[PDB]
Each structure stands twice: as structure tokens, then as C-alpha cells.
Amino acid sequence: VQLEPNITLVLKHLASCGAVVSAEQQAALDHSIPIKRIEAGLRSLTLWGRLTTLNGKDYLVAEGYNVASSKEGAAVYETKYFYSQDGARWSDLQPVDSETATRCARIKGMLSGDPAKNYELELVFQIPELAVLRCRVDAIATATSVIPTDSTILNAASQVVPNRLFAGAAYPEKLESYQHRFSLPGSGVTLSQDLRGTWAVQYDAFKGVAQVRSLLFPGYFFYYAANELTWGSLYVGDGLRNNDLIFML
Amino acid sequence: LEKTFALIKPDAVRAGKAQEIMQLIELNGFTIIAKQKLQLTRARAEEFYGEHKGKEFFPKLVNFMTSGPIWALVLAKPGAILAWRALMGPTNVFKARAEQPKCLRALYGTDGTQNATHGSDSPISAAREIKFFFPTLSGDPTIYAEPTAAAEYITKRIQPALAKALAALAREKPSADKFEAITFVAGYLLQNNPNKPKVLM
Amino acid sequence: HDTAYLKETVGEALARGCAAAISAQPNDPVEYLGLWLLKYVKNAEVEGNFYRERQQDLQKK
Amino acid sequence: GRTYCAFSIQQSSKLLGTVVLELFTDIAPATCANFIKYIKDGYQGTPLHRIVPNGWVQGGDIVDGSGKGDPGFVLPDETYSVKHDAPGVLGMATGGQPHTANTQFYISLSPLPFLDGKRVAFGRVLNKQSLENLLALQTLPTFQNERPVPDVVIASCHVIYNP
Amino acid sequence: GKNKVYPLELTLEEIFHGCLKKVAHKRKVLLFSGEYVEEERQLTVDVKPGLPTGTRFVFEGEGNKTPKKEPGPVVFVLKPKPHPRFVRRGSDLVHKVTLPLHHALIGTTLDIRTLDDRDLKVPISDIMRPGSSLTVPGEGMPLPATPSARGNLVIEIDLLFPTHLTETQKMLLRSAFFLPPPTEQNEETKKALRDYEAAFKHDLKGWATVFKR
DSSP states (O other), rough: SSSOSSHHHHHHTTTTTTTTOOHHHHHHHHHHHHHHHHHHOOOOEEEEEEESSSOOOOOOEEEEEEEEETTTTTTEEEEEEEEEESSSSEEEEOOOOOOHHHTTOOOSOOOOOOOOOOOOOOOOEEEEHHHHHHOOOOOOHHHHHHETTTTTEOOTTSSSEOOTTOOOOSSTTTTGEEETTOTTSSSSOSSSSTTTTTTEEEEEETOOOOOESSSSSEEEEEEETTTTEEEEEEEBBOOOOOOOHHHHO | EEEEEEEEOOOOHHHOOOHHHHHHHHHOOOOOEEEEEEEEOHHOOOOHHHHTTTTSSSHHHHHHHHHOOOEEEEEETTTHHHHHHOOOOOOHHHHHHHOOOOSHHHHHHSSOOOOOEEEOOOOHHHHHHHHHHTTOOOOOTTSOOHHHHHHHHIIIIIIHHHHHHHHHHHHOOSHHHHHHHHHHHHHHHHHOOOSSOOOEO | HHHHHIIOOOOOOOOHHHHHHHHEEESHHHHHHHHHHHHHHHHHHHHHHHHHHHHHHHHHO | EEEEEEHHHHHHHEEEEEEEEETTTOOOOOHHHHHHHHHHHSSSHHHHHHHOSSEEEOOSSSSSSSSSSOOOOOOOOOOOOSSSSSSOOHHHHHSSSSSBBBBOOEEEOOOOTTTTTSSBBEEEEEEHHHHHHHHHHHHHHHHHEEEEEEOOHHHHHHEEOOO | OOEEEEEEEEEEHHHOOOOOOEEEEEEEOOOOOOOEEEEEEEEEEEETTTTTTTTEETTTOOOOBBBSSSOOEEOOOEEOOOOSEEETTEEEEEEEEEHHHHHHHOOEEEEEESSSSEEEEEEEEOOOOOOEEEEEEEEEEEESSSSSSSEEEEEEEEEEEEOOOHHHHHHHHHHTTTTTOOSSSOHHHHHHHHHHHHHTTTTOOOOOSOOOO
């Protein structure tokens, strides 16, 4: 039914889970999301998340794509990520090559504010902080991008497009009603096929709203309201990974 | 059901009245077959206004038409050409205001040359201009599909290059399979042809 | 003789190419015809591929 | 996956050798079909007519056996795709003007660049023993004006490995 | 075997998108008259997206016609007009931006308007070295072979050092360039830094944000 999640509805439904942004930053977002959506050629630019930092200048990260195709048995989106400290002026996040993509996953810690920070590894490897930020965003998006099943569909020329006749998911408390965004529409892959204890679902059946929380990445929340058929997802907190899931559960 | 060409000039686009013009066009029964916003260059406008070659008003006409972006539209209706001439009204805005006060020239035009719209005159000119701005828009399956005209078309343009290609193929005689010969003749046609040059780097 | 070879090798597709080139009225009919022949062979192979993929998906389901 | 056919060469009741050939039934099908139909019914006693030292071993006339044309059929020109660049390239021969090919066939004995695009080549020798048999057939004791003085004859000919 | 070579000037936008040029030729046919007679032919040249500079388009059968020899071909050599922003270097563009020193050290975002109608804001990811550069992948000219992939935009950085510095500014710079690591600082050092930061960012009498006169 919906074609792009709102920022206001998402920030309203996920407020209870701590997924909130400052009010001045909220107004700046309201003004400066369309500006970036028009400056860049994108046609769907939403807010992805907000990563914390050693300063107060958290990283607000937005994501936008033009084309979304079906390549090699996977729905692939040519995503582009932007970051900002305040909601006013956005900058871009260039992708990182594989050598850095492997040398950036060993840098556990909380990111600092200035995006001109260099971490050191071992000879010494000097890595920029924006590379680490992009690595963390890519990992979280690979592990957590959640949408209701059958919300997308395949057309001619093999483009994944919103299912304009989507009638919602029956049993919105079962994990079988949600799927990764990069699963092809025909495939029966859902969040159930992931590790059993990774995802937690709390479903308010009276107000008809379901919340899916990631336990492997503790700061990722997703909401799905069935009566109005609106689904959104945000990530608040840093992008570190919960390795010892077996002990916590 | 016929169709005509019509462009909104830069004066009605600089004043932000393009959308209202489209709405009025649609309210009167027209159907916008295809639209495109585009800025002509000097050469393209001079080729566009070929009929009034060496006229007295040509300098200012070509200088105005390339001052800003314009809109190009194809409008479809049973009486599209005459209906668009009537709706578009008299060609002179000062005459238009006196004669027909509720017409596009009177409402949005300001000057003899800044009439804010341009339409076609006759079906031949309309088809020519639609082909000029929309090379891929189909149309006119009656005059083009005509045994005498079709034979003339093949003989005059396609036949001179094809005869040489079929000769070279008969000389070479490639593998008896279809695909190799088809690829060979297609590559030959795309390699040496009269109108296009050969690209080297 | 050679005319039979030319006929049963190219004529069937060349006639369709000529009809297509004369219906559309392009600006460069020769280049249009050449690109048409390339797309002709390409669409044959890709329609075979499409049939194969559809059958495979049905079987997997 | 092609077809194969073999025949023997004998000079004056003395077995001179045997040769096996692969036929390009995927490049020039009709020429191979005619060649196999004639090796099944024909070529059984047809002399080796023309023998050029560093050129080709020619022969295979039917109604005359001595190098003049035959009636009953004319073979059209199929394809110039196989290029004469290595020894042992079997092909058909015709007059200067195309579309007059007959049972006359020829096997190359050296790279022959000029023949490319003038003669239908539709086969090859398979091994080194056959090629050496032809190369030995070059230096016969005496051959008069490009014909062996005794009759170098195809004694036997058969088809193996395929329908 | 003489040929007439003509430059063909294109803008970077045309080569990026793929133009379709109509050029004019003044061709001379020699006759019995003392002077020649010439005519203007029109030639349609179709430049493909991102063709390399120096591409030759040869029109065979076009050129001055002597009485005996069939005229030789006419050659058009593709060259790009100068651009205010970009200069192409093979398959990717080059942008030479003059950078302030504090933008180099502290870091800012360069603003670049691409050939396509999209704006671009690229952060400075570290201390930009003198004569160093930055690379934005997928933001160059298209590949002539494949009509989808492109090069990578290259920003060549030329720092713009300040022309004047006072002695107190130099004192502040030396204190910034020799500050001890945060695990080596005294409590007096931390208190002094906090006081100075609260004074420099004072909302009414601090100079952290001023309005240009």
C-alpha cells in the first residue's frame, strides 16, 4: 500500500524504543530531506539511522536509491548513503574496497565526531573513520534490512517494485511475515530462516502494531502497523555487533 | 483521430504558466500524447524554422526561441489541427485581445513575436514536426505503407547499400548456417554505409 | 545457383527487417536495419533463455 | 562427432597404404552427403589422376577414370569456410567457374593459400600415418606428365564410426 | 591521396551524453572555368557517449573532386572545448580545486556540480597532503566500451595557505600542534582547555560564529 516510509510516522512509532532524534534536527530534516533528494538524482531518500559517538555530534545517516534490479538471484538496490552531524547539510559516503572492508571490521570501539579521524592497525595501516562508518552501515544493512513479505514484486525487465495491491501480512507476530529486502519476491526466504534467537517480535494485537527488534544488532528496530499498513525501520546506537548471543540468550 | 504538434514558448515558461496551459489544453478535449521540456540550441532552432529562411523577422525569432527552455507536446483529437488553431486563436496578440479575449494569446501572449505558443499549420507540417522532435513516436501508417511509395523508399534509400552487401556475401559465401551470414551482412551494413562515417580511434 | 543460397540464407529475416524499417521511417535506414538484425539474433537467444528460467522456477517451487 | 571414411591405395597389385579421413559434416553437410554416397557406390577402382609434387593428390573420376568431366549431376558451391593452410585438407574440385563440381576430389600436401575462397574444403586427414602415406606416394619410381606410369588405384573404400 | 582534416569541437556535456552533430562541408569541383565552383554538403556525425579524444570520423567519397581522380575521404577529428570545471584525462575527469589550509586540516566538504544535472558534496577524509588528491569512484566519463560503467572523478588539491598570521595566532597554532595526548593531560590542562572552549564559543561575546560585514 505505502510506497516509502515516512520520517514522522517512523519517529512516532519508534519513540518508545529510544529511537528519537532532536527536535531542531527534526525540523532540519523536514526541510533538508527534499533538498538532497532533488540535488542528487534519487527518487526515494529516507532516514536510515543515527549512530552515536564520543562527542554529542551523532551521525545521522540517510539512504537513497534510483534503480532496484534483480541480479543473480538477489534483489539488489544501487543504494547511496549520506551522513550529517545536523539535519541541515549532508555529505556523501563513498563505498570502500575489499582490503579496507576487511581491515575496517577489526576496529571495535565507539566512533569519534570528526570524520577526518584516522585509526591505526598492524607496519601500520592508516584507515579513515568514514570508511569504518560505511563498513558498519553496510554490515547492519546486510544483516537487518527488514520489510514485510510480498511487499515487493517483479515486473518486466526484472525490477523489484512496490506491490501496490499488498493487503498486509496475516499473523504479524510470526517472523514468517517479514523478510530481508534483498530476498527475491518469489523466494520463500524470511527472517525465520535466520538464526532462531536473533529476532524478537512484540505484537500489540489490540492497536494492531508489531515491533521487531534485532538482538544480534541490539539497536535496530522495525515497526509495522497493520490497520494503516505502514512499516518503517530505524537504527539508534552504535554499529557494533553482539558476538556472544549464545550466553545472553 | 488525428494529432498535431504544439510548443509552449519560453515566455510562458519563464512566467510559470506552463502547467495552467497544459491543464487548459486537457480541459478542452485534447490528450497529450507525449511531452518534453527542452532547450533548443541555435543550430537546432534554425533547422526548425527552415520555412522562414532569410525572412526579415528571422533573427529576432531565432534569438527569442533559444532564450529559455520550452515545452513540446503532441495533442490528439478528431479535429486536432483546426481545434488547436481555434483554441490558440489569432496569431497577433493585440488583434487577439480585441477579437477573441478568452484565448491563449490574449491570456498569456505579450507581443507580436512572443505569442507564447506555437502550433502546426497543415497535416504534412504537423507530421514533419512531430518526427522532428519525437523521432520514435509512431504514426501515419497509411501514407508510408503504400506499395508504390514503399517500393520507391526501398529502391531510393535501402536498396543501394543492400545490393552491395548481398554481392559481397555471395562472393565470400560464409558458412551455410543462417546466423553467421546474418551477422556478417549486418556488420557489413553497419561498417560501410553512405550517410554515416567510419569511426576510428 | 547462388540466388537460392542467398534466399534460403537471409531473405526470410531480411524481408521482416525491411518492413520494420519502412514502417518506422528512421533517419538512417541502413544502420536501423543492421541494429535490427543484431537485436533479432539476440532476442532469439534470450527468449530461449526466458523459457528455460521460467521452467526452472516452476520446478523448484 | 563427425563422420569418418577410409580407403586404400595400391599400385600394380602392391598395397601402398591406407588412409582414414574425417568429414566436416558440421561445416558443409551436402558436400559430405554427396561424397559419402559416392564412396559407398563408386571410387572402387578409380585411379589417382593428377599428382603435383608439392601441391595436391587429385583423382576420383567415375565414368571415365582419366580426367574428363562426367554427366549425370552437377554440385553447387556450398561454403568457403575451411581454409587451406595445413596438409591433408580434402576437398572437391571444379572448373574455373563455380557450380560445376563433380566427383573429382583432391587432398592438399602443403599450405595452399590461393585455393581459399575458390574450392569447397570439407574434410581432413586424421593421423600422421595417412599423411606420410600421401607424402610417400609423391616419390613414385616414374610418373609421366603428372600421372603415375602404373595405375595407382583405390582398391578398397569404406565408411566407419558414423551412420 | 590527400585528405581534408577538420577539427570537431564538442563540449564535455555532449560527449558525456552523446550528441548528434550536423556539420557543413564546402566541397570544390574543378571545371574548365578559371575559378572553381563549390557546394555545401551536410554530414550527420553521431558521437557515442564518451568516445576518446582523437577519434577520427572518415567520410569516404566526400572531398574536392579533380577531373580525373575520385575524391578522397574527409576526416573529422574530435576535440573537446575547454570546460570551466572539468578536464578529461582518459576515461575520468579531473577537477582542480584551490583549498584553504584549515579546510585541509580540520576538514570540510567540497561542492562539485557534475556534468549530469546532479550536485555532489564530497568530504575531506583526512589531512590533505600538499600535492595529494581525492577520488570519487563512478563519477567520471562513461566507458566507450560499456555504456553503463564510468571512470572516477579525481580532485587534485592545491592548498591556499593564509597570507598573514599574528603572533597570538601562531601561539595558538603551536599550542594546537604540541598538545599532549588526552591520557597525559593534567587537570589544570583540562580545566584550561574547557575554559578556553567556553570562551571561544561564547554566544554573545565569543568569535566562534560571526556575521560578515
